[PDB]
Amino acid sequence: PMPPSEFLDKLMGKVSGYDARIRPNFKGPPVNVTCNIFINSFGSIAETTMDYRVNIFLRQQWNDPRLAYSEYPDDSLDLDPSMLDSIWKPDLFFANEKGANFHEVTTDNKLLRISKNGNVLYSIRITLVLACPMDLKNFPMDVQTCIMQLESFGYTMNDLIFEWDEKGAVQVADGLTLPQFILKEEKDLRYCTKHYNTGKFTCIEARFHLERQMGYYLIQMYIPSLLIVILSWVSFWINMDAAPARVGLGITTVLTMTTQSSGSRASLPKVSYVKAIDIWMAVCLLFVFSALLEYAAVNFIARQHEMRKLFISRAKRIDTVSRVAFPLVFLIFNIFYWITYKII
Amino acid sequence: PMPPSEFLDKLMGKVSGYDARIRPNFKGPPVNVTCNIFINSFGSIAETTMDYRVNIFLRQQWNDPRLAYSEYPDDSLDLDPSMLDSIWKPDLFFANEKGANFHEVTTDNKLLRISKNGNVLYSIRITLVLACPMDLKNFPMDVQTCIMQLESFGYTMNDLIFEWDEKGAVQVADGLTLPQFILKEEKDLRYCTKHYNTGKFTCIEARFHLERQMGYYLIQMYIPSLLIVILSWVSFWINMDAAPARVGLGITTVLTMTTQSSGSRASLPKVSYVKAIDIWMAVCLLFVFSALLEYAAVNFIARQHEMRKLFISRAKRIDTVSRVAFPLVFLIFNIFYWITYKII
Amino acid sequence: PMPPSEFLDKLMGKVSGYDARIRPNFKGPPVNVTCNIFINSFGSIAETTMDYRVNIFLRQQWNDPRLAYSEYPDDSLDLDPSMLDSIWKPDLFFANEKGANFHEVTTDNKLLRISKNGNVLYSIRITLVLACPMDLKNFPMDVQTCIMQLESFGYTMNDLIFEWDEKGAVQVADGLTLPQFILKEEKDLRYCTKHYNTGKFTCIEARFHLERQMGYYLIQMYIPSLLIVILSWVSFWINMDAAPARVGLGITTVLTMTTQSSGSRASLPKVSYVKAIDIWMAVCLLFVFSALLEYAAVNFIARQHEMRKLFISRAKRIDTVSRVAFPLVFLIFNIFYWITYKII
Amino acid sequence: PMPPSEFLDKLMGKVSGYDARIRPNFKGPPVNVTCNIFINSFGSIAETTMDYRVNIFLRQQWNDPRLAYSEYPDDSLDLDPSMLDSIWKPDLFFANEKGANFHEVTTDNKLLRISKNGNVLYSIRITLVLACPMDLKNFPMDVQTCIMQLESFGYTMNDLIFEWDEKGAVQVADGLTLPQFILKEEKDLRYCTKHYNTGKFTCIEARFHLERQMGYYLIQMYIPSLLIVILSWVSFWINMDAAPARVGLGITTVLTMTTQSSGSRASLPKVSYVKAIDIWMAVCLLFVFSALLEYAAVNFIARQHEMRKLFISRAKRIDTVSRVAFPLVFLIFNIFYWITYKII
Amino acid sequence: PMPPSEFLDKLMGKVSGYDARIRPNFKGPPVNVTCNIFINSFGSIAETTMDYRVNIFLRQQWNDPRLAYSEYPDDSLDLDPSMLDSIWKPDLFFANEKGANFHEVTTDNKLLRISKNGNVLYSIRITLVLACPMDLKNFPMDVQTCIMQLESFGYTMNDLIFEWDEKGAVQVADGLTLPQFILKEEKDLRYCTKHYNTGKFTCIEARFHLERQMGYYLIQMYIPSLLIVILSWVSFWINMDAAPARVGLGITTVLTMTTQSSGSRASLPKVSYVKAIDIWMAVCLLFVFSALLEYAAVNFIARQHEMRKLFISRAKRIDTVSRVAFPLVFLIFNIFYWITYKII
Ligand SMILES: *[C@@H]1O[C@H](CO)[C@@H](O[C@@H]2O[C@H](CO)[C@@H](O)[C@H](O)[C@H]2NC(C)=O)[C@H](O)[C@H]1NC(C)=O
Ligand SMILES: *[C@@H]1O[C@H](CO)[C@@H](O[C@@H]2O[C@H](CO)[C@@H](O)[C@H](O)[C@H]2NC(C)=O)[C@H](O)[C@H]1NC(C)=O
Ligand SMILES: *[C@@H]1O[C@H](CO)[C@@H](O[C@@H]2O[C@H](CO)[C@@H](O)[C@H](O)[C@H]2NC(C)=O)[C@H](O)[C@H]1NC(C)=O
Ligand SMILES: *[C@@H]1O[C@H](CO)[C@@H](O[C@@H]2O[C@H](CO)[C@@H](O)[C@H](O)[C@H]2NC(C)=O)[C@H](O)[C@H]1NC(C)=O
Ligand SMILES: *[C@@H]1O[C@H](CO)[C@@H](O[C@@H]2O[C@H](CO)[C@@H](O)[C@H](O)[C@H]2NC(C)=O)[C@H](O)[C@H]1NC(C)=O
Secondary structure, eight states, rough: OOHHHHHHHHSSSSTTTTTTTOOOTTSSSSSEEEEEEEEEEEEETTTTTTEEEEEEEEEEEEOGGOOOOOSSSSSSSEEEGGGGSSOOOEEEEETOOSEEEEEOSOOOOEEEEEEETOOOEEEEEEEEEEOOOOOOTTTOOOEEEEEEEEEEESSSSTEEEEEESSSSEEEETTTOOOOEEOOOSSEEEOOOOOSSSOEEEEEEEEEEEEEEOSSHHIIIHHHHHHHHHHHHHGGTSSSOOOHHHHHHHHHHHHHHHHHHHHGGGTHHHHOSOOTTTTHHHHHEEEEEHHHHHHHHHHHHHHHHOHHHHHHHHHHHHHHHHHHHHHHHHHHHHHHHHHHHHHOO | OHHHHHHHHHHSSSSTTTTTTTTTTTSOEEEEEEEEEEEEEEEETTTTTTEEEEEEEOOOEEEEEGGGOOSSSSSEEOOOOOGGGGSSSOOEEEOOSSEEEEEOOOSOOOOEEETTOOEEEEEEEEEOOOOOOOOTGGGGGGGGEEEEEESSSOOOTTTEEEEEEESOSSEETOOOOOOEEEESSSEEEOOOOEEEOOOOEEEEEEEEEEEEOSSHHIIIIHHHHHHHHHHTTGGGOOOOOOOEEEEEEHHHHHHHHHHHHHHGGTTTTOOOOOOOTHHHHHHHHHHHHHHHHHHOOOOOOTTOOHHHHHHHHHHHHHHHHHHHHEEEEHHHHHHHHHHHHHOO | OOOHHHHHHHHHHHEEEEEESOOTTTTSSOOOEEEEEEEEEEEEEETTTTTEEEEEEEEEEEOOOGGSSSSSSSEEEEEOOGGGGGOOOOOOEEOOOOSEEESSSSSSSSSEEETTTTTEEEEEEEEEEEEOOOOOOTTTGGGGEEEEEEEEESOOOOTTEEEOOOOOOOEOOOOOSSEEEOSOOEEEEOOEEOOSOOEEEEEEEEEEEEEOOOOIIIIIIIIHHHHHHTTTGGGGGGSSSOHHHHHHHHHHHEEEEEHHGGGGGGOOOOOEEEEEEEEHHHHHHHHHHHHHHHHHHHHHHHOOOOHHHHHHHHHHHHOOOOOHHHHHHHHHHHHHHEEEEEHH | OOOOOHHHHHSSTTTTTTTTOOOOTTHHHHHHHHEEEEEEEEEEEETTTTEEEEEEEEEEEHHHGGGOOOOSSSEEEEEOGGGGSSSSOOOOOTTTTTSSEOOSSSSSSSSEEEEEEEEEEEEEEEEEEOHHHHHHHHGOOOEEEEEEEESSSSOOOOTTEEEOOOOOEEEETTOOOOSSEEEOOOEEEEEOOOOOSSOEEEEEEEEEEEESSSHIIIIIIIIIHHHHHHHHHGGGGOSSSSSHHHHHHHHHHHHHHHOOOOOTTTTTTOOSSTTTTTTHHHHHHHHHHHHHHHHHHHHHHHTTHHHHHHHHHHHHHHHHHHHHHHHHHHHHHHHHHHHHHHHO | OOOOHHHHHHHHHTTTTOOTOOTTTSSOOEEEEEEEEEEEEEEEEETTTTTEEEEEEEEEEEEOOGGGSSSSSSSSSEEGGGGGGOOOOOOOEEEEEESSEOOOOSSSEEEEEETTOOOOEEEEEEEEEEEEEOOOOGGGGGGEEEOOOOOOOOOOOOTTEEEESSSSSSEETTOOSSSSEESSSEEEEEEEEEESOOOOOOOOEEEEEEEEEEHHEEEEEIIIHHHHHHGGGGGGOOOOOOOOHHHHHHHHHHHHHHHHHGGGTTSOOOSSSTTTTHHHHHHHHHHHHHHHHHHHHHHHHHTOOOHHHHHHOOOOOOOOHHHHHHHHHHHHHHHHHHHHHHHH
8 A cells, every 4th residue: 555654644744634633532532541660670769869870761551533544554653753743642751750751862752553443552762861869868778669650641530541550550570689788679550640720730759669679888888897896895895004005905996986987877868866776876886985984993092092902802793794794785786776777 | 513623723823813922911901920839749859959859830820811711512622732822921041050950751831711701710830949048047956948939030020920829738648758857837928029121020938837857866966975975984983094095095085086076067058157056066065175284294194203192182183073063054054055045 | 923932033034135144244343242240149269279169140231223113113122032043143252261061950040032123131040160369468358350351263353342331340149148258349440452473352350358257267267276275374384393394395396386386277279478376376386386495495494403403493493484474475376476467 | 968966856756656655565575774973973872871872874775766867877876865755764663762862063964875776875973872781790891792783763664674794783983092091803793673563563673792802990999909908918917915006007908998898899880799890999898807807816915914924825826817818819819810810 | 246155155056066075176176175173172081981071173274166156356255154064074073072062152162264265264163082091100290192183084095185284283382281291392293194904094193292290199198108207216315115106106107108108099090000109109018018027027036034034135126227227228229219200
C-alpha cells in the first residue's frame, strides 16, 4: 500500500478532525492511563539536600478511539518522535521533581506506537532529582522510604485517572546496586490523590525502601571510638606516681573523642533531634571523661597527709575496682545499645 | 456543538479582534490581578549566599471581558498550554529572583481555564532561588524573615495592580517540614510598591518567619565547649608539684577551645559584628585561659624562698578558693547568658 | 482610534520602509545612546575566581526619527516584548562578562516605550558575573575597585557612542548591603574607549569602591594569634627546673601558630607577593619561636658546672629581662603595624 | 552540471518520495549500522559518583538504497549540517548516559557524506558522563572495567542491528594519558542485547580496562603509616623510668594512625566491605596499639615489690624480646600482604 | 541609492544563485582562512581537571568571490548578526574544547563585514574551557605549555586550509595578568594537521608558556617546613636528663611534618611520579625523624652501667657532633636542591 508515515498523516490531519488539544472520549468517561517505570540508574542519595537522582523509562498506555484503523495490514505503527506534537498525550508530572530533564542525544529518546484498536504505548527517558525527606532517628540503623509520585497537572479526576499496571509496575535493571544502601524487592504502590482550590487531581506513588549498609560506619566511627575507650583503660595499670603519664593520657583521649564526635556528623543535615550515633559518641565521651576524673580522685586522696598509710591504701583500692568496673559497665552498655538497634 | 478548542480559536482569532498584546479594559481602570501561591518545597537555606530555594504553584486570577462567552454550554474552557501565546497574561516577576526556571517535563507545567464571565485562572509551577538578607546578631537564637515579592515589569500602577486573595493567600503543602527551621503559620502580607525613574509599579510581598532549631548547635558547639571548661577545672585537684600535668592540661584546653571557636563559624557569612555564639566561645576561652594563669601564679609564689612555709601556705590558699570560684562565676555567667537569649 | 499595537505595526511594517537592521540617522552623525543602571543585587564577591555577581536593570535611551508619530493621541507607546525583533536596538555588551543571562520567568523581563518625538527607552534585567582583578597587598585593610564596562560590539565610534546620563547614572536599591564590604556612595564614571585591529569602539565604565569590614578578621585571625603569643609569655613565670613544662609549652604554641598561619589564606588566590596578614602571622610566629629559643639558652647556661652559683645567677638574669622585654617589643610592633595600615 | 546542494535537494525532496521518517529497506531485512568511536578526551573518573567523562567522535555507517545516484560525476556528497533533519538517521543512544550533550560552537560539530552506492557516513562529536560501577575490593591494586554501551531506542532487532567494524572499532587519540590510571590497548567488544516488555533492542558495548597507578598511594598513605609504626619501635630503646616519654610516645602514634586511617577514605564511596587499604591501616593500627600495651605490661610488672630484683629482671626480659619481635612480625606481615596483592 | 541591508539581500538571495551551503571557489583551490585571536580573559587554571578557561575574540578572514560588488559606493557592508545563516562560514572548532559557549546578552556577540573585493571578516566572542595536560615533575619550578588548536570538522585539506596571519596572530588584552602564573610574550604557532580514517583535516595551534610564581609556595610550604627542621635542632641543647622534653620535642616535629607533607598535595592530581615538593617534604621528614633517632642512641648508651664515666662521656660526644653535623648536612642539601631546580 502506502508508507506508514503517510497513512499516519491521514489519521492526524485536518481531514477526519483529529485535534491533539482534546482528550480521548471527550465529554465522556475519564481517560485511564496505566503506567510503569523501568529504573536504569539510581543513586547520589544526598542527605544535606535530602534528594536522590534516578534515571527511568516512563511508559504510559491509554486508548484513543480516534486512532483506530483497519485499512492498514500490520498491527502496529511506530510514530516518529519528530511528529509527537500532533497527537494527544497526558500531562503527567512529578510532584517532587526538584529538577528534571529529557535525553536528546543523537535522537530525542522518545517512543510511540499505536495498535489497531487504538492503544497508544508511549515511552520516554527521564532523569529526575526527586525529593525525599529523610528520617535519621537511628542513623546507621535506619530504613529510608524515598517515594516518587506521578500526577496530572491540568486534567482533573473526572477527565484523567492514572493507574499502575498489574504486570510488574516497577522494574529495576539487572545489575543495579547501591554503594551505601540496598533496594528491597517489595515496593509499595498506592494512591496519593491531591485536593487543591482548583480541583482534585490524580496521583499514583511508588515507595522504595532503602536499608543502609552497616559495615561502613563500623570501620570509620564505631571501631576507632571503641579503641580510644580502651586507650583510657590502660591508665589504670600505669603507676600513680607517674603524674604526666596518667594525666596526659586522659587529656588526649577526651579531646580525640571530641574530634571523633564532630566528624560523625560531617555529611549530615543539621537536625535538632538526637540520633543513634550521637548517643554512641556521647556515652563513649563519658567513659573517657570519667576515666580522667578517676585519677583526679586518686591524686587528691593519696596526697592527704598513720595518716599516710591509710591514704595510699584507700587510693589503691579505687584503682583495683576501676580496672574491673569500667570494662564491665561498658560491656553492659554495648548489650543494651546493640539489642535496642536490632529490635527496632 | 463544536469542540472547545475550535470555539476558543474563534475567541482568539483575527475575527472579533482579540489582540494578546493589549491588556483588558484598555484606556480604562487598571487590571486587578489577584494571586496566591502554593509552596510545594522549601529549603536549602544557604547563608554564605543568603538565599533559599522554593518550589511554588503561582495562581493568577484576572478578568478579560473580551473572553466572555454565552454560546457554549459548559461553564469553563481549559486552554491547552501549547496555545498560551495567544491570550494576554500579566508580566509578573520576582524582585529578588537570583535565578528561576519553569518545569517542562512531559508537558509544560502550565494551566489555564476561562469562565463564562471572562475570569481567567492561570497556574504555573516555578522554582525560585530567592534572596533574603540574613540577620545573625543572635545566631542560634534568631528568627529569620525571608520574603518574596511579586512585581510588574512593564505595566505601571495605572494599568495593572496586584493583590492577594483573602481566601488563604499562601498555602503550604501538608508534610512540608524543615531540617534546621520551623515555618510559622502566620504570614505577613503587605505592599511593597516600587518607584523608579520610569514610573511606579505594583508589588505585593509575603513574609515567612523562620525560627531555628536549637538542638543541633547544643550537641556540636555548646556541650563540647562546656566540657573543656570543666576539663580545665580538674587542674585544681592535681598536685602543685606535678608541673607538666597542670601545665600540659591548661595548654591542651586553651588550644582546643581555639579549634572549637574556629569551627563555630565554618558555614557562615563573614559578617563584622559579634554574635551570640561568638560571645560564648570568647568567654569560654577566657575561663580556660585564666585557669592556666592561675597555675602560673601558684608556680611563682610557691617558689619564693620562715620564708618557705609562708609561701606554700599562701599558694595553697588560692588553690582552695579557685576550686569554688571558677565553677561559681561560670554558673552565674550561664544565668546571664541564657536568660538574655530567651527574653530576646 | 485604532489600538496601539496595530498603530505600531504600521510604524514597523514593510510600508514606510522601517528596517530593524539599519541604525538611526544612517550615513549621518553617530547614534547617541545614554545609559544608566539600577543595581538590584550585588554580592558573592569571590577572590579565588576574582569575580562578582551583580543583578541590574539596564536602561538605554536613544532617538530614532523613523519612530516619530503625530496621528496617535497619547504620548507614549509600550511595545510588547514579543515584538522586540522588529526595531533597532544597540549591540551593547560587557567587556568583562564571564557569563551572563536574561530573566525570562513568567514573561521576558524586557521593557520598551516610544515617545512622540521618537525617543526609545529600553530597560532589561540582566544577571552578570563580572571579572574584577583583586589587589591584596594589605588584605584586611584594602579598598577594592571592581569595575563594569559597557561596549559596542559591531558599531564603531563613528556610528554609535555610549554615554552616561547626568541624572544619577548608577542607582542602587535601598536596602542593599554587603556582608563583607561596604559600597561607597561616590562612583567613578569615565570612558574606556577600545582600539583593535578592526576599529575603535565606544566604552563607558563605572567604578565601585569596596572597603572591607574589619571586624570579621579580628575575631578569627588577629585575636587568636595574639593569645598564643601571650601563651608563650607564661613560660617566663614557670620554674626553670620544670623542663617538660616550659619545653612542651613552647612546642605547642609554635605549631598552633603554624596551623593558624595556614588557615589565614584558606580562601585566597595563590598570589606571590606578601600581604598584611602574612606579615602579621610571620612576626607573631617569630615571637613564639624565639620564646622557645629563650629556654634553650636558659637550659644550656644553667647546666654549666664557684661555677654553679655563677651559672644559675646568670641564667636567672635573662629570665627577668625577658619577662619585660618580650611584651615590650610586641607592644612597639603593634604600634608600627596598625599605624601603617591606617595611614595607607 | 548543477551544484551539489541542489542535486541533493532533488534526492530528498517531495518528488521521488524520500521520507526521513522511514528506515531503509522497509518491510525487509534489518538495517545494519556499523559503528566506531574515536576517544578525544577521557578522564575525571569520579568514584563518589562512580562515573567518568569521555569526549568522542561517533561514526555511524549504513546503506540507504534511496540515496544512490549515478547522474552526478563525483563519488561523494557532503550534506551540510543545517539539512540533517531531512534524511533518516538511526536513533542510537547510550544506556548509561547520566548526561550528555552536543558541541555546537562556531558550527554544529556534525558531518555527513553519501557515496554513489548509497553508503552514509555520519560522524558527530559528543561529550558523555558515563556511569561505571566501581569495584574496590583491593583498592590501590585494582583493575577497573568501565564500559560504554550503544543501544537503539525505538527500532527493535528486526528493524535495526548495531555492529562494530572490524577495522579498529575503538581508536584513541595519540597523546591521551591519564593521571591516575593507564588505559590498556586490548579492548573487549561484545553484545549486550536488551529485552524489555516492549521488545528486544540491539546493543553493542566496549570495555575499557583501567589499571591504577601505584606510586601515588605509596607516598601519601603507605610510607607515612610505616614511619609511625617505626616511631612506636623507638619506645623500646628509651629507659623504663622515663614514664611520660614512653607513654606519651605511644599515645601520639596511636592517634595519628587514627588520623591517617580516616584520611585513607577521604575521597571514596561509602562501601560496606573491607578493602586492601583498610586492612593495611587496621593492622598498622594494631602494631602501634600493642606497642603501648607492651609498656603497660612493663610498668605493672616492674612495680611488683628478693622481690624487687626478680621483678626488674623479668620486665627487662620482655623489653629485649620486643626489640626483635615487633620488627620481625611486621616484616612477615609485609611479605604476606604484598605477595597477596601482586598475585591477585 | 538603496539601503545596504536590501543591497545585501540581493547579493544573498535566490536571484544570482548564492548558496550558503557551498564553499567559495568550489571545485577549485582550497579556501584559505586566516585567523587571529584576542584574549580577553585567561585563568582558573585547574590541575585536578587539567584545564583552563579562556575568553577570546575569534577573527576569521577569507575571500568569497560571489560577494564582490561594485554598484554600491562605500567600501564595506556590515551584515547584521540576525542574518548570519545566509552566507557561508567555515566550520572551525577546537580539538580540546571540553565545553564552550557563545555570548548572546543584549545581542549575539557576532560581527561580520564584507569588502568590495569579497573579503569577509568574521569576529565572534567565545568562552572555552580548554584541556591542557599538566607536567608536574618539578612542581613549583615548572613551565607549563597549555595549547589551543583550531580545526576543521567537515571540510578536508583539499577544501579548506587554516592559517595564522603574520600581523600578530595572538593578541592579549592590556591589563591581563595571572595570580599564579605569568604569560610569556613569545608564543609558538605551528601546524597540527590531523589524520583520521575519514581524511586529513587542517589544524593550527598556539602554545602559551606559563611560568609559575615562586613566592606563594615559599610562604606556605618551604618556610614552615624549614622551621620545624630547626625546631628539631633545639633538642641538642636541652639536657639529656630531661627525657620527656627531648622525646616529646621529636614526637611533635615528626608528626607535624607528616601533616605538612599531606597538605603539600591538597590541590593536585594524583600523579604517580615524584615531584620537587615531594622530595623536599621527604628529606625534611628524614631530618626530623633522625633527630629523634639521635636521642634514642643517647638514651641507650648513657644507661650502660669505670663503666658509668665512660658511658656518659661517649654519649656526650655524639651530642656535640650532632650540634654541628645536622645544620651542616641540611645546609649542603639546600645547595644541591635549589641549584638543581634553577638550572633546570
Ligand atoms: C476507566 O476505568 C474505570 C473502571 O476501571 C471506568 O469507570 C467506571 O465505568 C463504569 C461503566 O462505564 C461505571 O459503572 C463506573 O461508575 C465507573 N467508575 C468506577 C470507580 O468503577 C471508566 O469507564 C474507564 N474509562 C474508560 C474511557 O474506559
Ligand atoms: C480594581 O479594583 C479597584 C477597587 O478594588 C477599582 O478602583 C476603584 O474603582 C472605583 C470605581 O471604578 C473608583 O471609585 C475608585 O477611585 C478606584 N480606586 C480605588 C483605590 O478605590 C478598579 O476599578 C478595579 N479595576 C477593574 C477593571 O475592575
Ligand atoms: C551625538 O552627540 C554629539 C554631541 O553631544 C554630536 O556630535 C557633534 O555634533 C555637532 C553638530 O552636529 C558637531 O559640531 C560636532 O563636531 C560633533 N562632535 C562633538 C565631539 O561635539 C552628535 O551630532 C550627536 N549625534 C546625534 C544623532 O544627535
Ligand atoms: C544485515 O546483516 C545480516 C548478515 O550480516 C543479514 O542477515 C542475514 O541475511 C541473509 C540473507 O539475506 C539470511 O540468510 C540470514 O537469515 C540473515 N540473518 C543472519 C543472522 O545471518 C541482513 O540481511 C543484513 N541486512 C541488510 C539490509 O543488508
Ligand atoms: C591558498 O593558498 C595557497 C598558497 O598560499 C594556494 O595554493 C597554491 O596555489 C598555487 C597556484 O594556484 C599552486 O601552484 C600551488 O600548488 C598551491 N599549493 C601550495 C602549497 O603552494 C591556494 O591557491 C590558495 N587558495 C586560494 C583560493 O587562493
